[PDB]
């Protein structure tokens, strides 16, 4: 059968990947950032790296890394770069070195942090890129290698540059797994408020198990090409928060506006909601991360579905809900 | 003048004894974990530190690490050990490679999480140590190796078993920095609850600044010895939060018992808590970490006393207030 690599597969993207690719009959390897394999690595060795792509022989390799800035906060700058940005160059180069140029095909995982500053929206392929952390930068340098080998050695190499998405492994310090871990924890009377910034944000978000398959496709094609992967429909965080409470029978009302904005409980239908009644202000601002920010990220995955077919199947409220269905359980083994 | 090196230099210990060495006239000389000096290095490279000892030629050498397995978190087990354990027998290979025995003292920081199980209170010199967490057998290591080059080769070389100390330095993720912290910010209206485990748990807190003064006076004397550094004075988690909240004027009411416990507000006095008004409910209990425990940490600084005349000057209140002052500080720029 087919044989994949995965760098990053025990984080949100890479173990849905490799459930994707296992489900396929595929023989699947994998390194942290049955037919299933763990190799000891991280990328910053070109020696071990490149011993493990000649025992493997892969078809496919998926080089899945951080997805943000955020999540990227403990490490060292020179370490994040020495993984996200030179591990991609390795990569490349192990394969070209093994002689696998004509077998073996290179995702790379881009990220919509590219876009930085924005100015143009919705973003596309063709919307110029600015980036503003040193993990951007370092992403920068991985997507345009990527480029650069598929231009200059013909080789299968593309990126997908992947906007917000999300699921019930999306780490926590993400707002939407923030969000959902939180009022699953208040209906449970674990907690009392949760605090956000400004919560007419808008945002697009999409279901890592959709996007993970549109990254599979890439590597499907007759010729490798570069794809925006993102819904290109837009929320309020706001709703998000509105929706996750009622997955759990939370009707919310807001008063207030800017940084006096406030979520209060109008009405509670159900069991799962024991810790929360009408009347309860369960949702409020904290200043210190209110902004009122213009200029938007939003992709327009327009090409993706043009060329490839691709569109998300999974819904936001069906993403919200298995978040929050996920949040509830573990809350109620304490309420 | 005299020379120092201290390693975690820009720690909570490093930069109190920092202070409190270079106001003696020292010449200070730090790596992290005027007449001050930093150096690259973290203790993981023999040759980069005995360079470096190889040019500093200290009189007096403090290796202060990680105080806490907590604050230890986010590396690797592995690396923690190298730096910890290892670094701790670098830093004495190299006084002897220099041919630095009769110059250099040394001085190495234990912690009372050497306890672990604990048994018999106080805990004294003499209590036998018993580990809990790779942290803590890491620091098990660099106790038993700092005796034995004193007692193999006559070294200048003690530890100091530092029970807790705290300050406005104290990191976020201690106890007692998270309630100063909290309740000023419940005061000033940025948050509105403060969620402990057991308000019951006792336990032995003093003034950074105390603890690194014994540290000094440990390196001064004719023959090196090992001492347990605390209060050996218990309060309460509770008592810790009434202190806080009672910097600012609060009054608190503690009504129901253990994961029902809650912490009501009485009465306000004066203009700093204008967030917080009678009746109000700011402290409570997260069942997911309340635990009655028994054994309890606690340290009888008696040999410290009747050997080095040593005592802590600063009280439990003072450093309560001056935290909560520093914390209320910081939160009224964003009230």
Known sequence: SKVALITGVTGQDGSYLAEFLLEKGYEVHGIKRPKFHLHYGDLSDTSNLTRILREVQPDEVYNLGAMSHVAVSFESPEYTADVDAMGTLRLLEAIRFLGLEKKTRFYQASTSELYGLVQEIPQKETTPFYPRSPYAVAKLYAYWITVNYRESYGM???????????????????????????????????????????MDSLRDWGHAKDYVKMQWMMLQQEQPEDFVIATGVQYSVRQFVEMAAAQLGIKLRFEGTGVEEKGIVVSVTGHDAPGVKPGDVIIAVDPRYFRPAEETLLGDPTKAHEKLG??????????????????????????
């Not at 593309?158 to 707002?175: A, D, M």
């Not at 409220?317 to 304490?334: F, G, P, Y």
């Open 310 to 335: 691709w569109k998300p199947e999974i819904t936001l409220r069906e993403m919200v809900s298995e978040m929050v269905a996920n949040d509830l359980e573990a809350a109620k083994k304490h309420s």
């Open 156 to 198: 299968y190499a593309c990126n997908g540059i992947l906007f917000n998405h999300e699921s019930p492994r999306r780490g926590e310090t993400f707002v939407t797994r923030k969000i959902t871990r939180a009022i699953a924890n208040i209906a449970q009377g674990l907690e009392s408020c949760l605090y956000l910034g400004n």
